[PDB]
Amino acid sequence: FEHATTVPNVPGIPYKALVERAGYAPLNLEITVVSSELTPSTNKEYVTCKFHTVVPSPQVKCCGSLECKASSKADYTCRVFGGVYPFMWGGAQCFCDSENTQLSEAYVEFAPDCTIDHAVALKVHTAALKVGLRIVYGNTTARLDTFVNGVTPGSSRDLKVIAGPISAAFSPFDHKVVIRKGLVYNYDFPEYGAMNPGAFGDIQASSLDATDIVARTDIRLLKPSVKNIHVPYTQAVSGYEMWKNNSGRPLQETAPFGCKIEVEPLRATNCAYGHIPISIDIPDAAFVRSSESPTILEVSCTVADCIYSADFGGSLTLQYKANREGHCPVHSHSTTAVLKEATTHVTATGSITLHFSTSSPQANFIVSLCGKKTTCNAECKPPADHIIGEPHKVDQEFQAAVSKTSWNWLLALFGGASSLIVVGLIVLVCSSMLINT
Amino acid sequence: FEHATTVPNVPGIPYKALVERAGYAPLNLEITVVSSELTPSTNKEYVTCKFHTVVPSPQVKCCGSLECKASSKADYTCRVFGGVYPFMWGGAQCFCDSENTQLSEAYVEFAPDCTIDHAVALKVHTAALKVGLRIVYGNTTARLDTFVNGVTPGSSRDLKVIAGPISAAFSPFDHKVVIRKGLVYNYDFPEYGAMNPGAFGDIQASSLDATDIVARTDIRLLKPSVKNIHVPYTQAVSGYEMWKNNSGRPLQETAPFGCKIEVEPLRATNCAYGHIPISIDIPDAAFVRSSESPTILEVSCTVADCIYSADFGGSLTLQYKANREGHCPVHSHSTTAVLKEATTHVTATGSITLHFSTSSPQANFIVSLCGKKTTCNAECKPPADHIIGEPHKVDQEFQAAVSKTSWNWLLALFGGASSLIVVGLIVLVCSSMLINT
Numbered sequence: 021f022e023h024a025t026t027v028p029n030v031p032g033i034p035y036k037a038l039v040e041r042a043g044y045a046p047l048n049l050e051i052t053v054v055s056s057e058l059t060p061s062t063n064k065e066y067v068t069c070k071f072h073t074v075v076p077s078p079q080v081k082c083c084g085s086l087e088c089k090a091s092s093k094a095d096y097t098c099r100v101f102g103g104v105y106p107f108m109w110g111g112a113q114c115f116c117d118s119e120n121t122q123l124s125e126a127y128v129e130f131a132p133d134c135t136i137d138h139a140v141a142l143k144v145h146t147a148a149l150k151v152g153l154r155i156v157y158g159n160t161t162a163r164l165d166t167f168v169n170g171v172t173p174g175s176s177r178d179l180k181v182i183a184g185p186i187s188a189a190f191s192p193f194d195h196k197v198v199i200r201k202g203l204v205y206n207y208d209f210p211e212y213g214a215m216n217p218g219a220f221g222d223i224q225a226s227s228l229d230a231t232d233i234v235a236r237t238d239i240r241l242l243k244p245s246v247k248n249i250h251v252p253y254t255q256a257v258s259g260y261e262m263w264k265n266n267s268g269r270p271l272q273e274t275a276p277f278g279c280k281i282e283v284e285p286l287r288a289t290n291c292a293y294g295h296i297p298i299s300i301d302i303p304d305a306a307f308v309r310s311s312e313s314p315t316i317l318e319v320s321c322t323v324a325d326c327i328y329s330a331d332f333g334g335s336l337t338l339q340y341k342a343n344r345e346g347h348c349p350v351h352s353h354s355t356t357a358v359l360k361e362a363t364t365h366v367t368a369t370g371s372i373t374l375h376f377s378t379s380s381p382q383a384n385f386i387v388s389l390c391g392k393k394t395t396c397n398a399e400c401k402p403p404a405d406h407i408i409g410e411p412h413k414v415d416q417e418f419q420a421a422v423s424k425t426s427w428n429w430l431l432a433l434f435g436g437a438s439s440l441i442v443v444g445l446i447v448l449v450c451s452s453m454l455i456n457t
Numbered sequence: 458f459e460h461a462t463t464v465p466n467v468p469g470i471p472y473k474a475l476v477e478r479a480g481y482a483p484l485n486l487e488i489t490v491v492s493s494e495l496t497p498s499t500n501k502e503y504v505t506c507k508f509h510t511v512v513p514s515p516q517v518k519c520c521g522s523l524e525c526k527a528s529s530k531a532d533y534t535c536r537v538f539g540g541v542y543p544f545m546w547g548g549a550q551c552f553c554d555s556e557n558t559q560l561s562e563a564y565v566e567f568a569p570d571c572t573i574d575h576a577v578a579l580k581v582h583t584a585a586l587k588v589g590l591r592i593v594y595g596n597t598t599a600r601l602d603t604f605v606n607g608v609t610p611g612s613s614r615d616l617k618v619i620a621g622p623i624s625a626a627f628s629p630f631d632h633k634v635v636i637r638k639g640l641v642y643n644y645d646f647p648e649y650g651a652m653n654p655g656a657f658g659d660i661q662a663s664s665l666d667a668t669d670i671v672a673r674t675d676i677r678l679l680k681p682s683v684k685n686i687h688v689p690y691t692q693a694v695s696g697y698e699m700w701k702n703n704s705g706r707p708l709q710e711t712a713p714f715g716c717k718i719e720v721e722p723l724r725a726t727n728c729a730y731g732h733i734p735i736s737i738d739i740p741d742a743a744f745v746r747s748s749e750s751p752t753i754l755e756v757s758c759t760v761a762d763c764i765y766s767a768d769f770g771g772s773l774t775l776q777y778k779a780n781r782e783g784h785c786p787v788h789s790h791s792t793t794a795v796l797k798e799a800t801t802h803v804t805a806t807g808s809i810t811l812h813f814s815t816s817s818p819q820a821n822f823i824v825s826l827c828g829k830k831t832t833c834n835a836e837c838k839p840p841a842d843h844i845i846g847e848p849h850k851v852d853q854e855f856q857a858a859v860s861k862t863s864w865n866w867l868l869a870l871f872g873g874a875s876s877l878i879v880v881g882l883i884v885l886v887c888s889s890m891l892i893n894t
């Protein structure tokens with residue numbers, strides 16, 4: 021039978037359900053979420069690194085003109101100087117004194133170590149969740165990896181599964197992210213061509229081995245004043261290094277919902293946000309006939325000094341009388357109560373002891389011992405341990421959160437006040453009726 | 458000087474503009490969009506083609522039983538068959554009389570011709586637009602490939618131009634696009650792992666040469682009733698061929714505003730939608746000092762043979778008695794009328810005949826004949842032909858479509874009705890004044 025069921029998408033915390041057809045015995049569906057990868061659609065938009073800003077040797081022409089042409093090479097600052105006099109070791113460098121032209125040109129290039137120290141800037145638009153489920157039914161165990169997109173099955177040969185649309189869309193990455201050496205940043209980098217000097221992406225290329233490199237690093241060229249030849253340039257500081265100085269915090273540290281971010285590809289593992297509805301097609305071979313199943317006749321339950329916590333600190337004792345031997349599954353239909361064992365053994369009119377975990381101060385729930393119903397209504401104390409090392413397995417509800425005695429005095433007080441108003445109105449009605457006569 | 462102007466996005470249709478600055482004189486401006494590529498970002502969801510449904514050699518063996526194992530081949534289908542007894546040419550293929558076993562097997566691989574006859578599935582996310590721009594100012598022509606996404610300089614060597622956001626971003630592509638053989642289609646394909654029998658995406662892969670392929674076409678294998686060895690299988694029709702039968706028309710013939718769509722890369726060039734803000738900073742050398750500009754003592758205007766249309770059919774004649782010589786720019790300050798020319802060689806005293814287009818019957822406009830203003834009135838005749846080969850030049854406003862006679866008669870009727878209302882209230886007021894006495 022196809023059984024739709026809502027499961028929290030937290031890693032760990034095994035979730036339990038009971039499947040049942042009216043002509044068949046109940047079976048213990050066991051569904052556990054192991055992994056949850058949020059791999060979004062990521063496309064590379066540029067790559068940047070610290071520039072090498074290498075300057076070529078200057079050109080000299082002497083008693084003439086040396087006007088330079090435009091170039092198709094990154095950040096080509098070209099300027100000519102008149103009235104110069106280059107002088108290397110040995111003597112002067114041309115033959116005129118005053119009428120001279122020095123062609124000083126400068127460009128930038130990727131540093132030799134940009135193969136590693138490089139930040140790639142991408143856009144992230146839509147994230148889809150892949151979830152691994154371990155499901156055991158009728159002591160048959162299957163692990164399978166599926167999607168949450170709502171229309172995709174997985175290992176359908178053993179068990180047919182659909183994981184529908186998740187209740188909440190997280191998308192921890194924003195629209196526009198930066199990747200550096202395994203660290204993720206939500207940086208609003210400038211687009212391709214918005215070439216601000218001194219900030220991130222001051223030099224960008226399409227790929228790491230590419231000649232399509234653009235840079236607007238502000239290189240101001242100065243006319244030399246010394247007797248020797250050199251090219252004096254003053255350049256804006258590397259915006260890659262300035263961004264690295266005040267990048268902020270990576271998403272291995274600031275990811276909500278406990279996400280752990282991995283690179284190559286970009287993904288967010290072990291995220292616990294919302295709930296997922298999944299429809300499970302239980303195969304008919306796993307169904308066991310109710311005639312073969314040992315039926316139960318009398319059931320009763322009295323818990324003994326439970327606790328409510330993330331730990332499995334409560335225990336039922338179940339009194340019963342049945343007709344035959346065999347193991348049957350036990351499940352609680354209340355959202356407050358989840359048990360420990362998905363099945364137990366019932367032989368003949370004895371006793372059994374089971375464990376559970378709850379969150380309400382009142383332990384009011386229903387137990388399906390070998391099927392049917394068994395209502396347990398009791399009370400137990402809050403825990404003494406302040407902090408626990410495992411997540412809470414039960415979501416709180418306002419109806420269950422308020423304790424039973426608290427409902428008792430609140431209901432009695434509100435009923436008393438309302439009774440005062442009712443008796444006052446009744447006295448008014450009776451008094452008006454008598455004074456009318 | 459920053460001169461922000463709004464230019465129609467329509468390709469071709471050169472845009473006149475005027476740059477006036479105090480002391481730096483009027484100057485012509487020529488803004489033309491030559492090409493407008495709209496390149497989005499796409500991610501390859503999967504590839505698909507015709508499958509091959511290869512049936513391997515059968516595994517028959519005798520006086521025994523066979524049990525297959527799961528394989529990683531796409532759409533792996535076992536069936537073990539008892540009681541088989543195969544024949545080839547020569548006789549029985551095995552010893553054992555009746556109790557036998559044969560493992561009938563079938564899986565799915567690519568066709569040999571998937572290298573060309575394949576369809577890729579892409580998720581078009583968001584399209585940014587790029588304009589090749591041709592700007593002519595004074596006697597200087599420049600071409601620059603600018604980005605339209607926001608602040609991005611173009612040809613920064615001589616003329617920094619910033620193209621703002623588009624007025625209304627219209628995407629010809631839907632969120633899902635299938636490309637086959639250079640033809641694009643807006644097909645909502647099933648996602649990865651959402652295979653269906655007899656439908657598109659029945660076989661999916663990351664690439665054509667990839668081995669991690671998967672398919673869910675309904676192959677079922679039947680018991681071989683014939684005496685000879687044979688593997689009978691019935692399989693659902695190829696969803697690729699079924700989609701090819703009824704794919705519908707491609708987007709090269711259904712795209713709004715008429716881009717030409719071409720692939721590698723996926724792009725849609727030269728639609729015509731909306732308006733674009735462009736801020737241009739003209740270099741200071743191009744401005745002429747206002748002293749050398751030959752100004753007019755006084756202008757005049759007249760029209761001849763007006764035909765309001767998409768063509769430059771209207772003709773006007775202007776009289777001048779300028780004080781000096783030389784060429785100087787002329788421009789029309791009309792949102793509903795644009796001139797043909799951009800400059801005129803004014804010479805002392807004489808007459809200039811020029812051409813213009815307009816989309817209003819009452820062609821009244823203000824033009825600047827090489828300075829100041831010139832008011833022109835024309836009662837412009839309707840066009841003769843019904844269909845014109847080249848597009849329009851101005852957009853029609855509500856006040857422009859109404860001719861002078863229409864304003865006269867309509868305003869006369871509303872004025873008459875309002876006059877009756879006013880005189881009625883006046884007569885009521887004075888009648889109340891007389892009866893108050």
Ligand SMILES: *[C@@H]1O[C@H](CO)[C@@H](O)[C@H](O)[C@H]1NC(C)=O
Nearest residue numbers: 261262263264265266267268
């Ligand atoms: C940049 O790095 C220097 C190096 O010492 C550091 O002092 C400074 O705080 C960093 N940040 C800024 C914003 O200057």
Ligand SMILES: *[C@@H]1O[C@H](CO)[C@@H](O)[C@H](O)[C@H]1NC(C)=O
Nearest residue numbers: 698699700701702703704705
């Ligand atoms: C499919 O192909 C057949 C083959 O003749 C053709 O008649 C039919 O129009 C095509 N389309 C549909 C939607 O059946």
